[PDB]
């Protein structure tokens, strides 16, 4: 029910989400908690980037499992 989302700037972010829904739903949860729109997010679980329509147990992501979030940003 609780999964962690860790990022390149160091952060962990707990996300409560009964593992049975969709990846766009995790993206929406992260947008609410940190304001980053969904379309700036790439979600990777265990060396696998996650497709939207694919569901959370499609990718066997269980509770306490951890997802890595990389942002489609870049600077000069």
């Amino acid at each position: 029910m609780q999964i962690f989302v860790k990022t390149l700037t160091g952060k962990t972010i707990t996300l409560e989400v009964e593992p049975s829904d969709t990846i766009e739903n995790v993206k929406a949860k992260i947008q609410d908690k940190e304001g980053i729109p969904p379309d700036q997010q790439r979600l990777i679980f265990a060396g696998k980037q996650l497709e939207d329509g694919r569901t959370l147990s499609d990718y066997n992501i269980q509770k306490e499992s951890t997802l890595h979030l990389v942002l489609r940003l870049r600077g000069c």
Partner: protein, 183 residues
């Protein structure tokens, strides 16, 4: 008419993955970087002190996809420094918002290098002059802040000749981390 719309190399921007990758290739391991997102900094100070430095992606946000790389440096004691390749005034733009994220009692000073010597070339200066500034500011008898800023400015200006541009452009082009130029 001179056709083929041209992809200029000043528009090669480093991704977060690209910045991590550059530091990894240089040998600093899997580092944590920082950012300022929608005006609020995320900077892990534990990792900063452990690494000795931290690249910080400023000016990004919900709508701002491109932004500005700078370098946060930890000095001796409780002194932190901000290196901005665009110069002293630009960095002073971020002094405050970054200072509020450092340990109590800290001071954050901007390296007084000159503007106008960057030429639209991204990442190389933070990933080169920033590290060299870190080492300069952390030796037993460090020169003053003014002297480090002066040498950094002169180094950017002298590396501005053709040979330097060629070396930089080779590096920038070698950045197979597709932040397009329109690509």
């Amino acid at each position: 008419p001179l056709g083929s719309m041209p992809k200029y190399v000043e528009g090669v921007e480093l991704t977060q993955e690209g910045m991590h990758a550059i530091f990894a290739r240089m040998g600093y391991g899997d580092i944590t970087s920082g950012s300022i997102y929608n005006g609020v900094p995320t900077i892990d100070t534990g990792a900063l002190n452990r690494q000795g430095f931290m690249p910080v992606l400023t000016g990004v946000g919900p709508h701002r996809d491109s932004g500005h790389w700078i370098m946060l440096i930890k000095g001796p004691g409780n002194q932190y420094y901000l290196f901005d390749p665009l110069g002293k005034t630009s960095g002073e733009g971020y002094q405050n918002i970054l200072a509020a994220q450092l340990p109590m009692g800290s001071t954050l000073s901007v390296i007084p290098n000159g503007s106008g010597l960057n030429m639209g070339l991204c990442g190389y200066w933070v990933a080169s002059a920033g590290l060299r500034a870190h080492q300069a500011l952390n030796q037993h008898n460090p020169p003053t802040l003014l002297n480090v800023g002066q040498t950094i400015t002169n180094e950017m200006r002298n590396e501005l000749d053709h040979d330097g541009y060629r070396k930089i452009t080779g590096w920038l082009r070698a950045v197979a981390d597709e932040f397009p130029e329109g690509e």
